[PDB]
From a paper:
[name] is a soluble protein that controls the length of some lipopolysaccharide O-antigen polysaccharides that are synthesized in an ABC-transporter-dependent pathway. [name] from [name] [name] contains two enzymatic domains: a methyltransferase (MTase) domain and a kinase domain. [name] stops polymerization of the chain by phosphorylating and then methylating the phosphate on the terminal sugar.
We therefore designed, cloned and expressed a new construct, WbdD556 (residues 1–556), that was purified in the same way as WbdD600. We found a single native crystal that diffracted to better than 3.0 Å resolution (crystal category A), although there was no obvious visual indication as to why and this could not be reproduced. This crystal grew from the ammonium sulfate-based condition, but was harvested more than six months after the plate had been set up. During the intervening time, approximately half of the volume of the reservoir solution had evaporated, leaving a much higher (∼2 M) concentration of ammonium sulfate. Data from a serendipitously found single native crystal that diffracted to 3.0 Å resolution were non-isomorphous with a lower (3.5 Å) resolution selenomethionine data set. Here, a strategy for improving poor (3.5 Å resolution) initial phases by density modification and cross-crystal averaging with an additional 4.2 Å resolution data set to build a crude model of [name] is desribed. Using this crude model as a mask to cut out the 3.5 Å resolution electron density yielded a successful molecular-replacement solution of the 3.0 Å resolution data set. The resulting map was used to build a complete model of [name]. The best diffracting crystals (which also belonged to space group I23) had a unit-cell parameter of 158 Å, which is again considerably shorter than the 167 Å unit-cell parameter of the native crystal that was used to solve the initial structure.
Residue numbers in the entry: 4 to 377, 381 to 398, 416 to 473
């Protein structure tokens, strides 16, 4: 009998599924977490086009497991307490149509034994802190990595050090330390535990999918830096995910260890905001990539775009790949000239901001640096020369002749329309080497070093 099994529970942690007579006795009501978990289940189930296989780690009295089984899920629940599992099985029997299995077992062992594809979704609510306490942070990070590796998605409610209990002292400084090694993560809620005033964050984590309420898709690889050789400029607060026809930029506004300034957060916020603005409203006759999704919240913001073919110029340069400098410069200058005519300029023309397709046509890929108003744009023309030089001191005829021509122009005349015009006629232009010159060359060379 259920009554006896319930009585022999060391603790009625959760609501007893289907038995409201014990609702008052339950430490946690579970309705709030359930509402959120069911929402995420639905999202993922919709995306994959079917009911899910779900793994419930430290399943206690089976509330979440049974609740999901109720909606059609196939579930396996694990708990290391025999009493808990006995209740779960009993409840399952009262609901014979539910596809629900329960096993007495250790989370550590089950995770080690998992195979990829076995489960779509794993839930681990207020359990991993126990594992941290006995086995340390590094082992837990590995467990969670593997869990992520073998599933599509993972939901965790994580206990925190601020909680007033003795075990809090073993906890990481920040719960994100347990998951940040995983590819994708988002805060999805915060819950009152009724143990104390300190709430527990609930995180949605994945090593295989971008999981955004509006956009739920696999990705094939991701990176923590914008390009090969970026170093640590953004202090790792930015992540990039690449899928079949999309790129997802995910910016953290909030980082652990307080590492993001105020200024840096705001710049993350500003760049993303700025990028969305431009892409949603681009100028006529400018092939700009398309916006598939976007959003912001307190912790972070994101943008999903159409993917554009090709390789990043800076990589190609570094990896000594063969390039057509004429086609690259021509295509790029053409786009800059056209932007300018529409009263747009790009503040940051660099190799890491240029993408080159298989036909050696080049385009800009970072629209964070796009601007509308300012003498000007004389500075931008100047940097473009550096760009040119780095793309190759280094300029053969007629590129040198081109630059020399521009340098002979009064500064009021300098803009991208001019730069392009002269570029197009560069073979006709006088020879730089035949003139005193010689300074245009030395200035940029120093600039380009600088
Ligand atoms: C505090 S409760 C949380 C219960 C449930 N996940 C929830 O939040 O509603 C922790 C549960 O995990 C179980 N547990 C703790 N450590 C475990 C481990 N290493 N392996 C399996 N179960 C564990 C306990 O028996 C208990 O049922
Ligand atoms: N539309 C896109 N298609 C393909 N790759 C992209 C696209 N947008 C960005 N990237 C990639 O993102 C990386 C950094 O993107 P970027 O636009 O520089 O973001 P940020 O500079 O704000 O970090 C680039 O190295 C590039 O590989
Ligand atoms: Cl936890």
């Amino acid at each position: 009998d259920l009554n006896t099994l319930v009585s022999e529970l060391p603790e009625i942690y959760q609501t007893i599924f289907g038995h409201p007579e014990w609702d008052g006795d339950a430490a946690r009501d579970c309705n709030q977490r359930l509402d959120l978990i069911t929402e995420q289940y639905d999202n993922l189930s919709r995306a994959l086009g079917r009911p899910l296989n779900v793994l419930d780690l430290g399943c206690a009295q089976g509330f979440f497991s049974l609740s999901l089984a109720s909606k059609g899920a196939t579930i396996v629940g694990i708990d290391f307490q025999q009493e808990n599992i006995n209740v779960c099985r009993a409840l399952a029997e009262e609901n014979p149509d539910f596809a629900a299995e329960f096993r007495v077992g250790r989370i550590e062992e089950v995770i080690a034994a998992l195979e990829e594809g076995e489960f779509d979704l794993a839930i681990g609510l207020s359990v991993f802190h126990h594992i941290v306490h006995l086995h340390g942070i590094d082992e837990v990070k590995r467990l969670l990595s593997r869990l992520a590796d073998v599933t599509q998605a993972v939901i965790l409610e994580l206990a925190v050090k601020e909680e007033p209990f003795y075990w809090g002292v073993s906890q990481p400084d920040d719960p994100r330390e347990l998951i940040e090694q995983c590819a994708f993560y988002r805060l999805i809620g915060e819950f009152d535990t009724h143990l104390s005033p300190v709430p527990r964050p609930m995180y949605l984590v994945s090593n295989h999918r971008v999981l955004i309420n509006d956009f739920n898709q696999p990705f094939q690889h991701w990176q923590n830096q914008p390009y090969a050789g970026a170093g640590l400029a953004h202090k790792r607060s930015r992540r990039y995910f690449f899928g079949e026809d999309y790129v997802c930029k995910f910016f953290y506004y909030d980082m652990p260890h307080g590492i993001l300034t105020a200024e840096e957060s705001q710049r993350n916020k500003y760049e993303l905001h700025n990028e969305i603005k431009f892409l949603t409203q681009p100028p006529a006759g400018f092939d700009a990539p398309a916006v598939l999704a976007h959003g912001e919240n307190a912790q972070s913001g994101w943008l999903v775009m159409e993917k554009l073919p090709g390789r990043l110029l800076s990589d190609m340069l570094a990896a000594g790949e063969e390039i057509d400098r004429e086609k690259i410069l021509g295509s790029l200058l053409r786009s800059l000239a056209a932007l300018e005519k529409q009263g747009f300029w790009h503040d940051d023309v660099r190799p890491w901001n240029v993408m080159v397709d298989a036909r050696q046509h080049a385009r800009l890929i970072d629209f964070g640096s796009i601007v509308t108003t300012p003498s000007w744009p004389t500075n931008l023309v100047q940097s473009f020369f550096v760009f040119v030089n780095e793309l190759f001191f280094n300029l053969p005829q007629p590129w040198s002749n081109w630059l020399y021509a521009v340098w002979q122009e009064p500064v009021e005349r300098w803009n991208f329309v001019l730069l392009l015009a002269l570029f197009e006629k560069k073979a006709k232009l006088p020879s730089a080497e035949q003139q005193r010159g010689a300074t245009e060359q030395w200035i940029i060379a120093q600039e380009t070093v600088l």
